């Protein structure tokens, strides 16, 4: 359909650890450098995301409905949360 489709933005905010790294005199420098970047590398192959909209968390098993569905329009806020695991 009844309703023209509609392009439209969202902006998509973000609000929000140390890390132990075990190691030895005689390594290099690099292997703790790597082992960090490996660390963070892992941390997002495990991230979901998480999108909420007006207050209330939207179900990955929605994913199929249509943005026009949502109380969304042209600039509307959009929050998303990383989760790990």
Same mark, same amino acid.
């Given at each position: 359909g009844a309703f023209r489709g509609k392009h439209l933005s969202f902006v998509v905010r973000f609000p929000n650890d140390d890390l132990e790294v075990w190691s030895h005199?005689? @390594?290099?420098i690099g292997s703790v450098r790597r082992c960090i970047l490996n660390r963070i590398k892992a941390n997002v192959a495990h991230t979901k995301i998480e999108l909420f909209v007006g207050g209330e968390l939207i179900d990955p098993? @929605? @994913?199929?409905? /249509?943005?026009?569905? /949502?109380n969304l329009k042209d600039k509307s806020l959009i929050t998303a949360k990383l989760t790990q695991i």
């Open positions: 005199t005689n @390594d290099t098993a @929605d @994913d199929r409905k /249509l943005i026009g569905q /949502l």
